[PDB]
Amino acid sequence: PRYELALILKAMQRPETAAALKRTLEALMDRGAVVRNLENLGERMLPYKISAHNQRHSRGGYFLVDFYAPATTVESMMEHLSRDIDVIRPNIVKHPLTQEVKECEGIVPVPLEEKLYSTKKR
């Protein structure tokens, strides 16, 4: 994967939830994303009340879409998902599997520093 979409949707039932996911993925495919898979984290009560599209929500479903997308169309994706009203919060990040884990080889113990002051007698 290259990009990851943290997609928090409105809490609603199965058929319009699947329909909203359908039009979201066709919106991605219209801008040209090659989507790998879709992930559901379930529906959870939100950490805080989020105001979006003239409404206050407390419960919402968490979904993840990972894809390969050109760098110019991410703004178009964010604009379309901003105008979409069945989503409460879309965000696009670089996927963490792109970077590789550099090695924690251990904590190097730092010496206390020498030679900071002159050898004058106080």
Binding site: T17, A18, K22, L25, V35, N37, L38, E39, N40, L41
Partner: peptide, 19 residues
């Protein structure tokens, strides 16, 4: 990878399999 034909089955599978 998800295609146009694969999209319905993948949405139905993902809505049934949380992780």
């Amino acid at each position: 990878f998800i295609t146009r034909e694969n999209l319905e089955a993948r949405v139905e599978e993902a809505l049934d399999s949380p992780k």
